[model samples]
Target chain A: AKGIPVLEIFGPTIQGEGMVIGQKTMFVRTAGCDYSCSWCDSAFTWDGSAKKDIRWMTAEEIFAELKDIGGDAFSHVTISGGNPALLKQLDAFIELLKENNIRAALETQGTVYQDWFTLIDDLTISPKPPSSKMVTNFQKLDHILTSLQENDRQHAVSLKVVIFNDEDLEFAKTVHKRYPGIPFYLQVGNDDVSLIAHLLGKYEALVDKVAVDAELNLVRVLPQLHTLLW
Target chain B: AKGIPVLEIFGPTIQGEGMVIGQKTMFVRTAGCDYSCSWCDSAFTWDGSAKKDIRWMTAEEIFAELKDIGGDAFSHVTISGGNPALLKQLDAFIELLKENNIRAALETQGTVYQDWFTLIDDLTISPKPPSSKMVTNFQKLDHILTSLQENDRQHAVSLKVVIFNDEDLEFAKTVHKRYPGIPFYLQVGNDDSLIAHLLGKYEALVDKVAVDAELNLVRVLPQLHTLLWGN
Candidate 1:
């Protein structure tokens, strides 16, 4: 309740990507971030353009809003962000949602750590690739993966990397090789997110790339579905 | 090479739809089908339009071609068809692939069944709807579904219904309700399969209908790779 800055609350729409790709769910997109990757898809969180859009609210208010809009249509809620790990108090909302028998899922850049991450039903830790004009914070990333592993919370976790080029693919392979124990996903990076219609070819080509990679046998190559839909 | 007429041999690519939606496999589309549905996307197989494209090859030749093109890229081969059931010799090919440890998968209209169906790693029995202007032969469909169920081959078999309208959705519901135990998939019918490049608006509308249906138990998927990469 303390420092939960909500930016967008939309859905009863399909989860466009990740573990629950087609799952019907609501979204609670929190505001702000710790990293400012060059091609951050949801750049408004840190990029000043949508600063006026941020709504500073409590866990109860957010839950109430979800109930108001989506009602009983959704059984799942995806707490995405501009790196939701930036907020520690977000646990209150996570606890509130769980108490109501609603499954909570989230994605973060894996830059920060929080106790609440373990409580997430589906946690996708996407580390920015070289193409994003960002460097790997392996020290912090390794620590988080180790913690998830040691706690045996790996089942609820996945490591997703958005690959834009061969360099990004190499970085993704390294990430997959580093923590081969967990479920790994290589998402095809959408260079032009605004051009919604032509994402299919790129998506298929990316899947074929991962499929052929011997090292990426266990990995699932996917595209962001919302980009296709919207 | 004796004689297994091949229609289209492509892939070592991702399976665009059904049971193993994203599984990497090669596609060997056989020539000919029993049903001539109005909206049949692969009507060339039945309509005789692609007769010149069809090549009469044996099971061994087909397998050899798959190995040649796919090489080490794929471990699975999907024997799709104008109903591969029409070719009774598929059992030999299935057995051959099994012996080689290469997984085999297929989809058919369920008009006929060969013993080889039991050997398919992933099998989808798509019964045409009213939209396709073809009524399902329930008696035959039942025999296949029941055999799979009795043999505990539910894991290998899936009932896929291509939905284009509310009536088709109802038909899908009936099929799903009838065979409630088997995995059911309601695919978005590619009514406008031709206007390629990027028909995202049309694709979105199809997905919208599936999403609004409020059926969570069933997987309402588009030809995922198809939607992502038009035909």
Candidate 2:
């Protein structure tokens, strides 16, 4: 995908959260989003606050910029967004990433479906929960997940829901009921991006919530891993 | 297993170490051992120091005792020892546990094998590392692990080796290379046995060792849990 909206290119850092929490990898943050969740930590992607900073780069350009910075890291890259699935052409970069035999990952809010979903090695579809003040569109979310499953991309996919309170956890429980086969992750939500705050306290707070609930027994609860320790 | 040497039956507490570290369950510590390791914490098992403490109880009596104590918890039991594998008749007890549909687990030093090895829900084969001042007879160790594998007990089996030093880590590495299919766990070998000491310090110390090593990349390094918080 030439001329992709690239806002940031960084890493060779621990993938602070999600299915790849401990794995060190590079990050490519794309710009623009469809929803404005109240606690969107990466709000700049959608808010036009950093509009001047956006870089329109081709997949080839992003790949070259990657080798220069992550030359110290793995041959793996993670593409995230205010929703990267919005840019249909990002597939071009995912394909080019494979031409070099590099591993690629993407995370979206389960809002869109791309034919290239199969190309990602790790695809985390996080649907915003109640605490975010955003409602989930289950019909669209259902279709997106069903298509991914139909393609046998289950191995490449994971369903992660951020939990701030019991209301959000109940929503998390419903997502698991709908797609029982996808590996589900319940990550402790954070207004505080501090690892100690979450991994220690919120980790326990979230664990205490799921401690006895039979619905969450099959899930693995974790907190965000990286907190700018470097 | 009638006449099973029951030393301490406690819990509704954490399993301080091993694969089932975090799970809350009751502990059944049987007496006697086949080895006297230099750093063995449960020295009372073989040193004759706690001999007066051993209660020779039968399978029915042990189950009744579990129902008495762990009535507050899950129907799960952990059988540890100075080597519980040393007792041949314990299969009767594991069978009784199953009749109640209760889950049971065991950990041994990989020195012996029992037909009841298949009966345990969680079987951890922890071989004594070099720091223990004991030698590993791979001939005996190999047969035990291989026998468990042949019985399709692989789902229930895990190989754990405590790591205090790199010399011990290399021995741990050798064990994994031989039993590549069995799940391997590298617990930071501890003398302090403090979670902060090992989970914090030794965690990073052991993690620093395996940070880039290919052999240990597959292992999950954890420290001992449950330090007499009530201590």
Candidate 3:
């Protein structure tokens, strides 16, 4: 395989949210994005702020850097990005992780799909809601999720929606209503993450909203563990 | 029929915990307990502090009081206590609710079983753990839960354990494993009902215990009615 525009390769940190919330893992953050979210925390990936740092490395070469940085301290690897699905070249990189017996996970905006998605141990398809001010291509999302469902990926795949306000929570409800079979996660959206007390307060607020809602009776509500951990 | 020990009967309020957590219902809090939990939030129910307040009312009289306070705006009732299971004569009250087509619910420590248990709409069996400084009567609990299961009451029943420490969580795991069929609820010990450090503790409880293979299936919840109203 050719070059993967990786922005940063780090971790041996905790997966902060989604299905594997507490699983300890390393991270491989690739660069470039299709949709620019309003509250994009990792905007440097595609905003050209980190352009000088983008190293175009091969699949085998990326694994080498992971070993050099993480050593024997990890068994799990999480691939995140501006949108990791933008690259079709990640199949072999995903295969490379599997050959070495390391578990793989990835989160994408669900704008694109690669056949190699089935290889991911924990595949989180987080479709941006009204809060992102980005419209979802419903047909495209349907294709991606339908393919996963048709192929029996229910256990491996999950749908997470970030809720910032009443509108965002409604959007979360809509998404869960549309895809009732997949495991749904409702996460607290903290646009301002610097204050620990304020962060947990938002989480408590989200819990209060979810705790009483009958529509979301069976789902798991969470705050980002990374924000909580430090 | 004999008079039932009545504490404060109120609400048209939300059922705060267990399977029917968000349910809107009137409350009929009874008085008394056989096992005095160290962190019993409703200590006034059994600790003799509220002895002067206890009114022994009949089933029909209690229903009339509920109607007088709640009006036609309610269709559900939640019976809470220092241990509502101690009363064996409440079968007629449960039957009275069923007669008018109102749903009923109650929470007990599973120390005693009333024949009326299978009649209540939502039955919660909350077992005390080591932190409560009380020994669980496993034999008595098994008999009570087994009777419910034998009567095919899976949908109507749940087992909740209040967690204060690591030992309490292990106890929760044991109860879940032993009675795998019943719905399990791991409560964030606020033991704080009478204390916000809870949100911090809630996340830790979820991350630490909710992820375990042994304790795989659960709905880890905080006491919402406490957080909502000052219980």
Candidate with the greatest lDDT versus the true structure: 3
Per-residue C-alpha lDDT of model 2 across residues B120-151, encoded as one tens digit per residue:
98899998889889999999999987888889
What TM-score does each prediction get for chain A alone? 0.94, 0.95, 0.96
Report the Cα interface RMSD of each model, rounded to 1 decimal. Answer: 3.6, 6.2, 8.6
What CAPRI-style quality would you assign to candidate 1? incorrect
Residue A157 lDDT (model 3): 92
DockQ (C-alpha based) per candidate is 0.20, 0.13, 0.06
lDDT of 1 by residue, A166-190 (tens): 8999999899889977777777788
Write candidate 3's Cα lDDT for B41-131 as tens digits: 8898998998989999999999999888767656778888989999987888899999998888899999988899999878999999999
TM-score of 1: 0.72
Report fnat in order of the candidates.
Answer: 0.14, 0.00, 0.00
Clashing pairs in 3: B12-B26, B192-B195
Candidate 1 lDDT, tens digit per residue, B70-131? 77666678887778888887777788889888778899878887777889978998888889
* Candidate lDDT values, in order: 0.77, 0.75, 0.80
lDDT of 2 at A36: 89
Rank by lDDT, highest first: 3, 1, 2
Off by over 4 Å in 3: B1-231
Q: Candidate 2: list runs displaced more than 4 Å.
A: A1-4, A56-76, A95-103, A193-199, A228-230, B1-231
Better of 1 and 2 by TM-score: 1
Clash-forming residue pairs, model 1 = A200-B228, B4-B57
